Amino acid sequence: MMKFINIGYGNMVSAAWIITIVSPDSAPIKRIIQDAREKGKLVDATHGRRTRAVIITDSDHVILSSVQPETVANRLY
Amino acid sequence: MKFINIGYGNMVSAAWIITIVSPDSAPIKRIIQDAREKGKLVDATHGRRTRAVIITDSDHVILSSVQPETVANRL
Amino acid sequence: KFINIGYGNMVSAAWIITIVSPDSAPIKRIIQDAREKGKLVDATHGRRTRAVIITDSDHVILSSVQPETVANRL
Amino acid sequence: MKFINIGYGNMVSAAWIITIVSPDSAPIKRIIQDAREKGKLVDATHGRRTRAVIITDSDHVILSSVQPETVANRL
Amino acid sequence: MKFINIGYGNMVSAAWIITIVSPDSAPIKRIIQDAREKGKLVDATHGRRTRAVIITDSDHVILSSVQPETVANRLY
Amino acid sequence: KFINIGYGNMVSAAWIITIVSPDSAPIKRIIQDAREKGKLVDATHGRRTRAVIITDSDHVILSSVQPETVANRLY
Amino acid sequence: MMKFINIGYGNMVSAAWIITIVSPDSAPIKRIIQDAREKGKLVDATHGRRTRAVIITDSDHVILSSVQPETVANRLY
């Protein structure tokens, strides 16, 4: 088990503060992203690639990753 | 143990769950629409029927296609 | 960690601030203040309210189960 | 030691108590009055006294009929 | 311990204290009047001389008759 | 607990949410949001920004070391 | 390891609540300091001396200390 998790391309997220990791497959989650981008709380760490996991933290930040949600929690190890 | 699979690969951190309840009551459908309004509704049912509603500490309301007991024992 | 408060509904113990009897407060005011801010959680499933669970983040959760028996389930 | 019975079956979680104080101070009587006004008051003193004022996080205020040192002793 | 006696039976949980400072300076007495107005002041001196100001996570300020480096000593 | 992010400045690892590369374009709004709002802490101390540390109090801290350097210095 | 850190002239700070400890060099912190001074979440534990470290806590308190930042951090233990 690691405190910080690689979410791709060197960007790190603390596991202690993750609320949820979800797929971008729905409409309510696209609104979560747009609401985040509007409030300046969106953190885009796909570095260009297709977004595959959406990380929501306590501080109401939304973090976009290029890896799969099962993979993210796995990288906790 | 820390991250819980609530259906279709969607993960939730057990450290932040306040409560898990049944969808089968009118007050709790109001909680769901109250969550869409403040932009705090996360739908993880992947299109299926809602069977557990997860309320986190950040006031997020998360919708799961899995029974509450199943979520509880997946800790 | 998780405590069954009746009818399958779970509350995480780590976030409960207080558990209070409906005879022992201006409960109707605490409850109606909770619905007003949209933080009322009804897990009585039609039965009578017998324990009121205040959590951090100001959620208020109605349970049909006796207060101290909820505590004993720790 | 986690949960405490402070009066008539009313429970408080020790991890969320900020301070247990004695009554008979002017500022705390405004804290009690402010919380009673603001809805965050929990009265466990069925009359007969008030000997401890319990302040938790999220400014919930709780009145108990036994001395603060006793309230702490129940840990 | 978990809870600290700060004078005359009044307790503070160590986990919620942010800072304990001397009363002897101008900036702190504005903190106190600020809290006294907004009703987040807790007076636990039982009338005696104010020698430490405790600032907790809920923005409460708690006045104690005991000295700051004594209050920290009662932790362990 | 306490990590040196360069030139004497410390950050407590328990309050970091994310550590991001200054490459990602949307963060530059994140930095200007903090700098304008007075929540920005610049510890690059003249040098070039190599990691952006975001904390729970919505503080944004600029550091001159790699995000991998910040996370690794935990140990 | 200890919970309370002596930051000068008897003033204590709980380590659990510290977010960051920084040098007074940066002109962005003077705005942070000066924001907190008028706003009334500033604590001045310098006892009149020159400011050597700025402690930023959870709940947005800004605590000014007269010792160096490495000094506050190493005095944890």
Residue numbers in the entry:
A (entry chain B), G (entry chain E): 2 to 78
B (entry chain A), D (entry chain G): 3 to 77
C (entry chain D): 4 to 77
E (entry chain F): 3 to 78
F (entry chain C): 4 to 78
Which lines from the publication concern this structure?
Bacillus subtilis can form structurally complex biofilms on solid or liquid surfaces, which requires expression of genes for matrix production. The transcription of these genes is activated by regulatory protein RemA, which binds to poorly conserved, repetitive DNA regions but lacks obvious DNA-binding motifs or domains. Here, we present the structure of the RemA homologue from Geobacillus thermodenitrificans, showing a unique octameric ring with the potential to form a 16-meric superstructure. These results, together with further biochemical and in vivo characterization of B. subtilis RemA, suggests that the protein can wrap DNA around its ring-like structure through a LytTR-related domain.
Previously, Winkelmann et al. reported another loss-of-function missense mutation of B. subtilis remA, named sor4, in which arginine 18 was changed into tryptophan (i.e., R18W32). In our structure of (Gt)RemA, arginine 18 localizes at the inner surface of (RemA)8. The guanidium moiety of arginine 18 of one RemA subunit forms a salt bridge and a hydrogen bond with the carboxyl moiety of aspartate 59 and the backbone carbonyl of alanine 17, respectively, both being from the adjacent RemA subunit. Thus, we decided to determine the structure of the (Gt)RemA-R18W variant. Thus, our structural analysis suggests that a major reason for the change of the 8-mer into a 7-mer is that tryptophan 18 is unable to interact with Asp59 and Ala17 of the neighboring subunit and thereby can no longer support the subunit orientation required for the stable formation of (RemA)8. An important consequence of the formation of (RemA-R18W)7 is that the arginines 50 and 51, which are crucial for DNA-interaction in the wildtype protein (see above), show a different spacing and orientation in the 7-mer. The observation that the RemA-R18W variant is still able to shift the PepsA promoter-containing DNA in an in vitro EMSA assay, but is clearly defective in vivo shows that the (RemA)8 is required to address a specific DNA topology to activate its target promoters.
